[PDB]
């Protein structure tokens with residue numbers, strides 16, 4: 001009884017980012033992924049250049065009508081969206097979630113509010129952030145912002161774990177039942193490691209792993225993998241703790257392989273056996 | 288060094304066919320796949336209906352210009368083409384193959400001349416067939432036609448295994464060094480078995496496996512998976528016999544899992560472990 005996820009995000013022909021980074025790892029974990037690509041780019045934006053195009057918003061709507069047309073929309077367990085090529089796609093993606101839920105009221109909407117962080121190298125189109133803030137957030141059942149996005153969504157700064165657990169709950173209040181702060185940064189207990197947070201209304205778990213020295217060029221996609229894998233674990237019945245721990249270790253595995261190979265692109269394929277069964281163990285802490 | 292394959296063929300959001308059928312198994316076997324999708328369809332054409340779009344020919348070329356721009360083309364080890372959305376995509380693909388070859392002279396063009404049966408089978412645009420006999424064939428280093436495609440490519444009927452090895456070699460005289468007759472059908476020893484042929488100027492190998500009964504609804508993508516895995520096997524050093532034995536066993540596992548699950552869509556994900564490590568053994572015969 002495999003889980004089916006309609007993942008609506010970017011696709012790069014060369015390299016990994018969005019669906020190009022998330023799809024394979026998710027399938028290696030035994031889940032089905034229906035990749036509805038939002039763009040088809042030659043490579044990701046951190047290169048400072050890339051060719052390709054943005055799928056028109058109406059194309060995305062037309063794709064799902066086709067899936068409904070063959071009577072399969074009801075088999076979808078979740079809709080995950082991530083990097084959008086334009087703000088107008090957002091609106092159609094919400095119509096999609098509405099249709100998916102009409103066909104399956106248990107389907108969940110997983111919103112990874114990928115906003116543009118030009119300094120880190122991620123280029124996102126204008127209007128996309130406002131979309132997450134005013135429409136995406138309220139419509140989501142699960143949301144996964146990094147620290148910056150958290151601030152943009154709750155509309156105020158966050159400077160520690162306590163404030164993060166609080167800010168997350170401000171979002172939960174607006175709709176999502178689960179919040180994944182996929183990168184605490186300065187707001188974590190230690191800024192010398194990688195920290196994440198998985199918060200619900202009644203509970204909150206903390207996890208961390210070591211930062212991997214990549215210098216002036218961190219590999220794109222860590223957060224897309226993290227989001228993809230988390231949705232997969234939860235849909236499969238993993239507890240909040242189990243989900244967080246497996247996901248943290250698997251990503252670290254991809255991390256070390258990528259660095260060992262002296263590669264800039266996340267090595268999701270080479271590290272595949274350790275995504276399924278990672279060898280490193282990282283402990284979560286219930287706050 | 289992990290092998291890199293630029294695969295130019297279809298993408299379906301729901302289901303498996305083209306890159307959506309071949310990509311996962313290829314990566315599962317440890318190769319990288321750069322998927323340059325020739326279309327983004329809701330499902331495969333054999334449902335009798337679908338939505339989505341064809342990528343414009345120029346789109347295929349600009350994507351590759353993009354990969355060249357970041358200086359990565361030279362890492363491409365092979366260009367694989369399969370289902371094309373239009374006849375003009377073919378021309379651009381041959382431009383792509385020359386570009387990849389100028390950057391990496393050892394790179395190979397693998398042509399799976401999908402011509403379809405636009406009536407009772409696979410729905411392919413008019414003129415694609417013509418592109419294959421005219422250009423695909425002579426530009427290709429490896430070509431994998433099924434029985435109908437072979438007859439069309441050599442311009443004559445083929446009625447048994449020996450005429451097939453013969454027709455394959457008439458193609459080799461036109462350009463490729465390797466021919467995979469991906470399904471012998473009526474031209475094999477028996478129609479009660481799935482047969483294939485891997486042929487070169489000096490040798491030829493025949494292999495068979497049991498048929499898997501799906502009634503009237505025959506799963507799509509078996510040929511796409513077979514070609515991709517053969518390319519991966521060959522690029523990573525397998526002998527003709529090794530390549531053929533592994534690909535035949537692996538595809539068979541996918542088929543038995545598809546049947547056991549009573550699925551119409553090739554279960555390339557459910558059977559992933561038996562793709563890398565098949566539990567069935569099929570012996571190839573050197574003619």
Ligand SMILES: *C(=O)c1c(CO)cnc(C)c1O
Pocket residue numbers: 297298299304305328330331332333370401408409410507508509510511
């Ligand atoms: C044939 O149904 C088909 C192929 C051939 O495997 C590849 N892509 C698509 C979309 C279709 O329909």
Ligand SMILES: Cc1ncc(CO)c(C=O)c1O
Pocket residue numbers: 010011012017018041043044045046082083114121122123220221223224
């Ligand atoms: C194309 C593309 N898609 C997704 C992301 C990050 O989720 C990036 C980050 O740079 C990107 O460039």
